[model samples]
Target chain A: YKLNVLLAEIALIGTGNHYHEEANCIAEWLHLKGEEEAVQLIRLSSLMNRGDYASALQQGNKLAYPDLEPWLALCEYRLGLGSALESRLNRLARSQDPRIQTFVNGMREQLK
Target chain B: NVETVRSITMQLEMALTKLKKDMMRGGDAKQYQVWQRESKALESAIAIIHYVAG
Candidate 1:
């Protein structure tokens, strides 16, 4: 699928300076696929990518996806909110998803 | 600072490549769907890392 190809490229090759454009393409594809949750997630991700942590955190609080949690924590950390970052990390630590667990571990390692 | 973010991106990218290979091995549809979601999430993480680091 085109979305897979696009995502693969983004994951492997980096988005360079076209992140907004690439994210738009991804959102469009998710919309066309009727992936409402994915569309919202991607939108939230784009907000973070643009360094709008305040807005990203605001939007993130309204959404509940395991995949979104790590990004939200990163946003908190970026915004220099120590308590908020710790809170998010604690919440994420409860997740049973191995991917999330790995993310949390990596996040803690980097913050150290 | 950027190198820290790059390290995470590289790790995610490697996991993503592995997931892609696993998906190609003909898994159940449900498992394939899980891998798809994981791949998408990884892609978003990588993108966010690049944008924020730059």
Candidate 2:
């Protein structure tokens, strides 16, 4: 299994919100490859999609990866934790990853 | 053209098979409906591609 190809396919499935099955399929493959972060990210995104913000936050907090920060912030925002959400947004503001930045911007707008 | 169509059909069939197996070992019922839709779409695609090639 090509790691890059599977990662791209997972990203496409996540973005399209096609079905959890499609994303879960790729996530399971990634899990077999020992891609723990990818699997967690996929699950977190799926949780977020299902509006399970509390669960997403719980899972996101356990992982310290940079990519997970925006999601953590978004989860906090959705759960209405004002102080924590602000802190997350402030910290995430300095992130160099465009994907993270895009999520931050989206969350900022959602706040407004 | 024949080889290309066959390859595509085989790939779709493999995908359809995986979806069916996953459905059998189910999780969310709503997700199963989505997978069923995908399977139907794949079946339609396989048929349409074969029809066009013929």
Candidate 3:
């Protein structure tokens, strides 16, 4: 598959909230040209979407992706991480991307 | 009929939007996510229904 097509598919799957299918797409690309961190992020997203936050957090701690911070913070909020959730979410809400900032704000609303 | 399918799809979409708003207000992130998945399934079903009806 063309790289652009594969990326568009990934974006579509993610937008559809089909994280497991998205992870599978990522897996196929990795088999073609592997990146360990990419694999971890995909798997973590799948787990998070599957409501397996404990495992997601465990795996997420081992990886670094600014995009994943909202998700990781969401996991923390889900786990009732308490006072820390606010600070972490506030930190991520500083994202240059207004959409991400909007996302962070929405998640914070649910936490309240 | 196309009209019926389109009407139902519109109604479903509206209801889903309302439910999403409520879910966002004070709901568990995981539970809200499940609603999101359900909403997507409804959207796909609506698309297929429209295609078949058309």
Candidate 4:
């Protein structure tokens, strides 16, 4: 199955700089149209990437998706994140909360 | 769909709900501390995935 085809059908092609939001839009559409579906399908790729065959197989059964369109995109994202971990983290989700610091040392919290 | 993922999703939802409830009630000191420390990680995870599919 051509992923680009399905993504286009779902209006996911070139959605935005926020891939997660794009996925969420798909999920929202599914929800609106009365279907049980999800947007963030990367967990499948992550499972496979982590060599968790059992989990991947189990998840496959759960999703009932024979083709790998949704799963592959997530796999790509995972690899993409790995390639530029620091920069991507900042770009994607830099928690502005002072309670949670970045990879650098800048914190003053009382979780204790 | 796989029943296993459904099961996993249910469990995670329970854990997340429990965390929220605990925070509400000020019940779990340990978790509250962690929430204070790792609030960002917790919220990000929740925001990313609410259920297997909502």
Candidate 5:
């Protein structure tokens, strides 16, 4: 009934351990609320947290409502694989948002 | 460690993107599908890289 899976949350709090905690929190929250959806998110998020974004995206494609996890993972996979972050992600993240500027703030904030 | 692999990965993705745009002159949904398929595989490979490089 519980799975400790909050990498993003850990990432939100600190890059060391909280991401897994956050992921667990999210997984538990979703599961307690709804199993099927929560399970799928956990499955997908599990892959992503371990840096398997491609697997996450492939699974994501099958979801009726992807909730941006898969798309973002796929993009990250591309960036990770293609080297776009060395140049783009922050810019893209900053560019389209246009309102919440965090220059040099996201440094190491991105999940590897 | 992850640097060189990341570099090559980016190059591949960039090449794919460029190819898609250039080929747009005579492109089709099917062609796009093909590119998408390739990208999927590339993503899968990247996942493995992450696991290993980490």
Candidate 6:
């Protein structure tokens, strides 16, 4: 759970320059092939920070966990999926857990 | 204490809904509003864990 701890720290860090640097390192560490599910979760996060939207989307598909959906939907959103992304995120916002729903609602259409 | 946690969760849910409505109404993205929301949610999650574990 060490990586999880660090990832949580990054989330708590929230928005800033050091957040990206720390996230990049953790993401790289998590990117080892044959990654753990937990590791992949953070990997997807790192890819998002790295702006590798496609890879983040690909990573997201391998799990059904609610916690990761926002990042996946974010990748789709940033990838210019547009209404497709919004549709997907809205569905997730309704269907997923409370945390996921909150995160998705906030993320679904902010970039516009 | 349990009621307080429930209230906190409800607060988060309502906050998200308001954030969504505002975003749909063309809220300011440049304000980093999403970051604040997520940060509070994350902090709330951590607080819940600490409360439960302690």
Best by DockQ: 2
Q: Which lDDT tens digits does candidate 6 get at residues B1-54?
A: 877546544554565566556556654675445544444444444343344422
Task: Tell me the lDDT of model 3 at A74.
Answer: 75
Shift of residue A62 alpha carbon in model 3, Å: 1.4
Q: Which residue pairs collide, candidate 6?
A: none
| Model 1 misplaced stretches (Cα beyond 4 Å) | A2-16, A19-22, B1-54
TM-score of each: 0.54, 0.56, 0.49, 0.25, 0.29, 0.45
Lowest summed lDDT window (length 10), candidate 3 chain B: B45-54
Name model 4 segments beyond 4 Å from true: A1-112, B27-33, B36-54
Query: Docking category for candidate 3?
Result: incorrect
Clashes per prediction? 0, 0, 0, 3, 19, 0
By summed lDDT, the worst window of 10 consecutive residues in model 1 chain A runs over A8-17
DockQ-based CAPRI category assigned to the predicted complex of candidate 1: incorrect
Off by over 4 Å in 2: A1-4, A7-22, A98-102, B1-54
Please report, as a residue range, the 10-residue window in candidate 5 chain A with the lowest summed lDDT.
A1-10
Candidate 6 segments whose C-alpha is farther than 4 A from its true place: A1-37, A108-112, B1-54
Q: What is the TM-score of chain B alone in each candidate?
A: 0.86, 0.83, 0.58, 0.52, 0.51, 0.52
Candidate 3's C-alpha runs over 4 A off are A1-38, B1-54
lDDT of 5 at A76: 55
Give the per-residue lDDT of model 5 (tens digit) for A1-112.
0112222222222212223443444344345445455556556556665766767656765775424433353445454654643343444454444322342234335543
Each candidate's DockQ: 0.05, 0.06, 0.02, 0.02, 0.02, 0.02
Q: What is candidate 4's lDDT per residue for A43-85, written digit by digit as tens? A: 4434554555456545654665423432432333444433433
Query: What is model 2's DockQ versus the real complex?
Result: 0.06
* Alpha-carbon lDDT, every model: 0.69, 0.69, 0.62, 0.40, 0.46, 0.56
Superior by TM-score: candidate 3 or candidate 4: 3
> For each candidate, C-alpha RMSD in Å?
11.2, 9.5, 15.9, 20.2, 19.5, 18.0
| Candidate 3 fraction of reference contacts recovered | 0.00
lDDT of 3 by residue, A54-107 (tens): 898877878787777777777888888877678877787778988788888798
- Output the number of the lDDT-best candidate: 1
Model 3, C-alpha of A21: deviation from truth (Å):
9.8
